[PDB]
Amino acid sequence: FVQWFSKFLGRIL
């Protein structure tokens, strides 16, 4: 589970 790594990457991925 990742919320901080996706809050910045999930926005580009």
UniProtKB/Swiss-Prot annotation:
The protein's superkingdom reads: Eukaryota
Q: Does this UniProt record's set of keywords contain Membrane?
A: yes
Q: Give a short account of what the protein does.
A: Amphipathic alpha-helical antimicrobial peptide with potent activity against both Gram-negative and Gram-positive bacteria, and against fungi. Mainly acts by causing perturbation of bilayer integrity of both neutral and negatively charged membranes, probably by forming pore-like openings. Also displays anti-leishmania activity by damaging parasite membrane. Shows hemolytic activity. Also shows cytotoxicity against cancer cell lines. Strongly binds to lipopolysaccharides (LPS) and its lipid A portion.
**Which consequence is recorded for altering residue 3 to P?**
No change in activity against Gram-positive bacteria, weak increase in activity against Gram-negative bacteria and fungi, and 2-fold decrease in hemolytic activity
- Can you say where in the cell this protein is located? Secreted; Target cell membrane
List residues, modification Leucine amide: 13
Q: Please identify the protein, giving its name as recorded.
A: Temporin-1Tl
User: What keywords appear on the UniProt entry?
Assistant: Amidation, Amphibian defense peptide, Antibiotic, Antimicrobial, Cytolysis, Hemolysis, Immunity, Innate immunity, Lipid-binding, Membrane, Secreted, Target cell membrane, Target membrane
A cellular component annotation (GO) from this entry:
other organism cell membrane
Q: In which tissues is it expressed?
A: Expressed by the skin glands.
The family annotation for this protein states: Belongs to the frog skin active peptide (FSAP) family. Temporin subfamily.
Recall the taxonomic lineage recorded for the source organism.
Eukaryota, Metazoa, Chordata, Craniata, Vertebrata
Give the organism, scientific name. Rana temporaria
